[PDB]
Amino acid sequence: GSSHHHHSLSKQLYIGGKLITSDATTEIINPATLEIVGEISAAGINEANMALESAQEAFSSWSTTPAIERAQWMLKLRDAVIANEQHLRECVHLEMAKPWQSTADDFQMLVDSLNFYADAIVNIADEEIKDNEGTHSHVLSREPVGVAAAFLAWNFPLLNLAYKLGPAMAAGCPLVVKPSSKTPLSAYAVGELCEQIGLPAGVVNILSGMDSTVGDAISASTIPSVLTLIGSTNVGKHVIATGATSIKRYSMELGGNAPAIVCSDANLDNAADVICGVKFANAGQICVTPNRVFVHESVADEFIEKVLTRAKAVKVGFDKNEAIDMGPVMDANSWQRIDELVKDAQQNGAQLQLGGKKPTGVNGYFYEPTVLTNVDSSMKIYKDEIFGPVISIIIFSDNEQVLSDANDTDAGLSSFIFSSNEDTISYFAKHLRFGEVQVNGIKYSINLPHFGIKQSGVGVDCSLLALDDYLAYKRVSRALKV
Amino acid sequence: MGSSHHHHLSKQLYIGGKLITSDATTEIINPATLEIVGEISAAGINEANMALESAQEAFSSWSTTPAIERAQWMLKLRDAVIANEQHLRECVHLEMAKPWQSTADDFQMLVDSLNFYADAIVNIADEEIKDNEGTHSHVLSREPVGVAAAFLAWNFPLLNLAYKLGPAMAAGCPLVVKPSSKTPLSAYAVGELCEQIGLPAGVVNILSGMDSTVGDAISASTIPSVLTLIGSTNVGKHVIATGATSIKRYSMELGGNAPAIVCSDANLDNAADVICGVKFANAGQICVTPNRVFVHESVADEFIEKVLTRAKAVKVGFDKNEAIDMGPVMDANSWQRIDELVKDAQQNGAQLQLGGKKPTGVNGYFYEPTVLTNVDSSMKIYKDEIFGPVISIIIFSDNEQVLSDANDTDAGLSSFIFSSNEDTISYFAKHLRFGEVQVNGIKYSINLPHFGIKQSGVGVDCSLLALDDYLAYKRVSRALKV
Amino acid sequence: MGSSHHHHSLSKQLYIGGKLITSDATTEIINPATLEIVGEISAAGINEANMALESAQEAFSSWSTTPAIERAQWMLKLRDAVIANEQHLRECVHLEMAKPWQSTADDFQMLVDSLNFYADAIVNIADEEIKDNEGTHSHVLSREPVGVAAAFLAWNFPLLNLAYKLGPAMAAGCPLVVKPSSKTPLSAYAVGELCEQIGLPAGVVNILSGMDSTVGDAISASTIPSVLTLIGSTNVGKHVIATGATSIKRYSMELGGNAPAIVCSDANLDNAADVICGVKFANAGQICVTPNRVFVHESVADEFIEKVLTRAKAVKVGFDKNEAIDMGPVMDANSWQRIDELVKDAQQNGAQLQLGGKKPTGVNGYFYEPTVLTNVDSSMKIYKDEIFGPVISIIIFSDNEQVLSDANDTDAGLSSFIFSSNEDTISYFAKHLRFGEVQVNGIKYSINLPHFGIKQSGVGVDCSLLALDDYLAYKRVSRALKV
Amino acid sequence: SLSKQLYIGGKLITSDATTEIINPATLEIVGEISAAGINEANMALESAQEAFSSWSTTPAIERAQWMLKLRDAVIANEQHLRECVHLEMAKPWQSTADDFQMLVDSLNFYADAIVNIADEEIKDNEGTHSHVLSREPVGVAAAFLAWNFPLLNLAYKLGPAMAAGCPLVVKPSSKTPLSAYAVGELCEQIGLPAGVVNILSGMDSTVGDAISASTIPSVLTLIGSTNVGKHVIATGATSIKRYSMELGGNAPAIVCSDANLDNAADVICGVKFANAGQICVTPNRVFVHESVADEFIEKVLTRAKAVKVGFDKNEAIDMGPVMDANSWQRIDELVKDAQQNGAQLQLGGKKPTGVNGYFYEPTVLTNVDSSMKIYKDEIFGPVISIIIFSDNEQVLSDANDTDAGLSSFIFSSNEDTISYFAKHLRFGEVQVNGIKYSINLPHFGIKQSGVGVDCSLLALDDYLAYKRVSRALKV
């Protein structure tokens, strides 16, 4: 699976504590059935400015609301999320054809984050700093930073929202949320729940619209003190440059290219379950999933056989009342991009062992579980992020050489090492230039920090560190001799 | 101790462990005598690219050099700095016309930072993270980030270098430094000391050149992982946009507009000593020095009299073998900018109590200690950063009203409160929207965090937190069931 | 000819090094009338920009040494492909900025006219012998290709702005790197497709769009270009000059304008209203040479204002290539708000809104109604700044010598207009107006007529033979006669 | 011995600072000038701006009359003008004639050219409009002059600027400011209207940047180094300005096998030793074919031995010292770096015996190749670096292997070798079997050597702006 361990189809914008319409609508098409599943009120530049000014107007009172009272609001919203679980998961199911069991990750992370950051914020304590000369006292404290704006990717609509909504509410930062236009229903539904519980106006705002107009207007605004993004590396560079109209804190999780190293002493059944599980969950559209699977030559044939067995057993389709393991990819551009990487690999010598096409007799953006062997470092599927249900296998023999190959990327999100040797595990854990090194498994949770280095982004999601973006320091220094 | 920092010539480019010349030179003019006092080899984009490429090649060896061993290099450099104290302070004296005693801030902060961060990096310890499900173990560690680049302001040529050099060396990031072309001599002298001790090539690089070409080439390069800047908010925003060729970490200290509030129950002698001390130290060219002095009407006549007495006793001039309190400002642009702020205030009702002109019979960029009263929120001197030896006084009546006036700025660096009332102190310390609140005094040191909020920048200089920009996290998670 | 220029798309890839290529990025194109996506381009990064610069550099020795006859042959082969794809090229301009269908002809036709004019001009370039006063040497003065050229194009005339640089650069054998505005890149990307179709030699023409602070700065800061040319604002003009200082480069640019249009007591009021209204509402007033300050004499003020209001009311506003539309919307919301602030600022300082000054009722896009303001004075923002919109700003004057000082009271120096029947008055204003162009009782621009500004409006000349000067470098060969 | 004041706003004024001028041959003080500060630079710029409306509207016939009046005073003060040059940089008396004569030639050439400027009619293809193309003064001009030719460099800018009605702000090099200050005294003596010509010297970083960064100048012109040119471009970006520059060169001189070796040695040695080789168009790399190598080296050695080096107004001195200690050390390190990589020093390469002045002997280097810094960088000194070649196509590739693009030299008697090199040499000027420069011949560089043209009618282009007047014929 994803290894994220837990702890009215017409919707309007949620701006300024009210549900409002606009001058335009957006029809949402299910990527499996290609049928319209709903519509949202689409935001324009005028609606973006309304959300920003409403968030700014709320900052003074929301940031001075005691932390215990802000937590009370977070738990009241949590209780409404729990009471409306079925509709929230149905929104994600419809907008992106995510399997019904897979929608539990989105819903439950929303509950977990609300719980985690409501509990963490009431435990924040001031810190005293020693004065080496004995002349002054020093108290270090943390205060809300300002208005925050969040651009969410479509792969996990409610989980991505949970990563930002939790810390912002807890840290008293009025939040402007732009869900992806491909998956807005579930976020708009959260906005309906905020309106239902009577959340103070401006504290949370949810609006979707076109990127080059609404997205740029949020970035170029001088109101936001923090701009946070989950998306592509090129969009991250666009947000940084566009947000330069003022001084802003940036934090983003961008593209990855995770190497997975399976050694000769590795538990092959466990390595196969872990890799296939996360490579086919959400159809491989996962930031931390393996992108290049390196396998030792001595266990290559046996490991490929174990991978094919699991890949053939993946249940593909779109049916909430069946045990579907994997759905389609997001849209047509994603399908053709994945297919171009797979076909280019074959044309350069890679061997297709399974999949590599759309299931016959279907029209949605389905791509079959794919297994590619004989992949080398000169191929485009090696250099680029697949973000799809494709297992690409590279054969290695020297631990020192495969370490250099694993590091031969600008990405810096996750990485995997499967081995039974303690010196081998220690060797790769220290030298892998990645934010996360998963040993003999994979584990993510609201209390564990999730982050990338290098060109995979800035900042941390989950854990107490996620509050860093939304809290600013203050040093009060007083002379003791008055 | 007026500046509040509490302690604890033809020069070539230093690039890739070697001292090299170029095709051009830059003359350095003393701002007091208007005479040439030195020359440096000016860098072009070719020299900028050499420093970047040499720092990139050094990252593999320097980042994997043991922290104890990197600290030994920092102490070796510190030993050469101490042995060259006179020449280093002479460079600051010549390029800035700083009084001899005021060059101690530059020199001693360089020693203090090398000591503090050599000691800090060897005490960095890993952090265990608890797994709530008991299925995995989690180890959080910190590693070098990559190449760092630093753009330094001219007001503290060696102290500004100290804030970046200490953390970057300790954290194993090769550093590319661009001192201001107005004050490059003292930094170039540090490059000579680096070469003298045999520092590995690329670990430190010093080069000065045009902002439009050399500065942009450094920001636009894809090599730097961290961009740090001490400067103006316009250069800040420019660096963020031009750096958007890659994902970079940004650390900045920009404009300040510090309010200093002298209440009815304040120690007037102490308040006048602190305010006057830092307002005339370095000719008021200090990021944390008060910009707007608010004084309660009940003690305004007495406090203004104490300010004028101190301001009249300031000895202005330039001579290393004389006892001089205050030197001139940096250049003609600064002189005219300061003078326009004073004249504009006079044209709108401000009363010139002292100064407001160049002293008699001198040609350098000297500006007399200036005192203005009857200043209001509409004047340019209220809205903009003086960065000069001008005390601008506003009379207030209500503590809750003056708090709103104090916060009526986008700056977020330092602030000051002078009061003997514990409730008044707690009220201002909590509600002042600034990174630092100085109560009944002023205190800065290498162990105390120095940071600004809002449009005054992002990041922390000094204290352990200054390492955060140069260190990247890593989570190693291992399945315990194996 | 309302614009005064007298004639003689789902997904597009980058045209770099003679190949159509994709990138890791993608830029959507929004129509400013419908606010819907109409197109898609592969966005360039600094890597693609350096690929274009390097391919253009590699092509210089081969392209610059290609005979002028053969280069003009390639220019006519491109021209034939332009004519064969006129429909698609104009639909690209129509879609990217909602320009009325007839107004798209200025873009398309100037592309044809420039390819013809400079293909013919380059083959008539002859050497010039220089006399030696001492009889000791011979002197031959010739002209050669200067190097690689880079062009930054504005959005107001996507293909016409391309035409001004593509013609001369191809003819003079300078490999060209073109950066269209990211607001209107569709039309130029289509020309790149045509270049690839006819098999133009690699590196001779390169077309790419991307962010200004990254892609645009990478082109200017490159040491490869010998000539940097720009059609844009005064602020980006100064930015390009400073950023290009990494090497010695020729600069040529057309920047902001602030044209005065003086309607005297003896002017043909019908002719003056037709000319001023025609160019003020063509392309929604987004024209560098259009009047910005309309000065009208006291005795003819009321009569001229009524004639202006009659024409402004007749302007048909909308967006449909299969309807009769005079005027479309402005480019984006920033321009709309910028124009609206100028109109409201004037009202707050005493100007009288006679017509328009708002978006038309019940419409979606960035439409701004044809606007007429009277009682405008020199203190207003609308007097000091460039409107670049469909606003006629009228100032009443009484003295010809005073209105001459008022007209010259600007740092702009593009076009200017004088309407009068008095020959002495015409000679007085044409001599004393400090502008690059003085238009008397009309307005006229064409591929053979030089178009240029002075003062802070820019340097260099577009159109006419003089436009070649930026792409050609002189050479003097001097030989001692005494063997 | 002489004290010269600033010429600003039609007045001779003093300032708070002074600069002493030291002769580079005797190392003795020869005079002083009132040094300009930023305030004096603003004064000159504002006075030039103030004069623009009256001076640019002064008839071209009347402007030419002021140029000839200045010319008359220049002729009457020839001895003193050439004495300043002789004293400020120890230029030999015979060589100072080029500085003085170019000043009188430029005043004459451009006072006559401006009164013959005629409007041009442009044809309207449609017959609906008439079009007249005229030229008008651009605005205030500022000129930064190098020290190698103090008066000749001034002449290149003063003539066109006065003729085109552009008030001019002149910053002579602080190393050679005396001769130009003397011109300013003549400008004050004849009663030239205030602001039309302004002369001031000062610190490059303060006074030079204050002129470039000011928004008043419409034209920034410079004769100097390539690095200074890039600095002026970026610094002047505070407004839109016209730039015209003559920067560094690296002229290749190709001595083929069928060349007149006597004539080639005369031309090359003559210009390589005049002004101590401190000439923008002097050969920097001398390419000689193998068949004529040792015969040409011998002839070059003969003329280089006959060079009379010294500093004496009453002696027929051929060559003085170089400008300062920086230039001497820079030239010496180029020769010793070439020797350290295999260059055979044949003559000179040292300071003459017991001189102590900044003298560098006439130097001849052989066995120079493309690796050496003396091959890549501009010598700007009395050094002849010879490179042996064999094939014409290969040495043409070597000749163009530079970012410079000023002058070039081809010596050959074959008509096809002449046409082959004259076409493929990527330089602004190709001198064939000789060298010629005059006020009427255009002087310019391409590539990294600058933009714009000095001398000839094309020099007026930087100071004149076009205007198209178009009228509707049907009214």
Residue numbers in the entry:
A (entry chain B): -20 to -14, 1 to 475
B (entry chain D): -21 to -14, 2 to 475
C (entry chain C): -21 to -14, 1 to 475
D (entry chain A): 1 to 475
From the paper:
Furthermore, transcriptomics revealed upregulation of the CarPUL during growth on ι-carrageenan, while biochemical analysis of eight CarPUL-encoded enzymes revealed carrageenan-specific activity, thus associating the CarPUL with the ability of these pseudoalteromonads to liberate energy from carrageenan.
The first step in processing the free DA monosaccharide that would result from complete depolymerization of carrageenan is performed by a 3,6-anhydro-d-galactose dehydrogenase, which is putatively encoded by the dauA gene (locus tag EU509_08920 in PS47) in the CarPUL of Pseudoalteromonas sp.33. Recombinant DauA displayed activity on DA when using NADP+ as a co-factor.
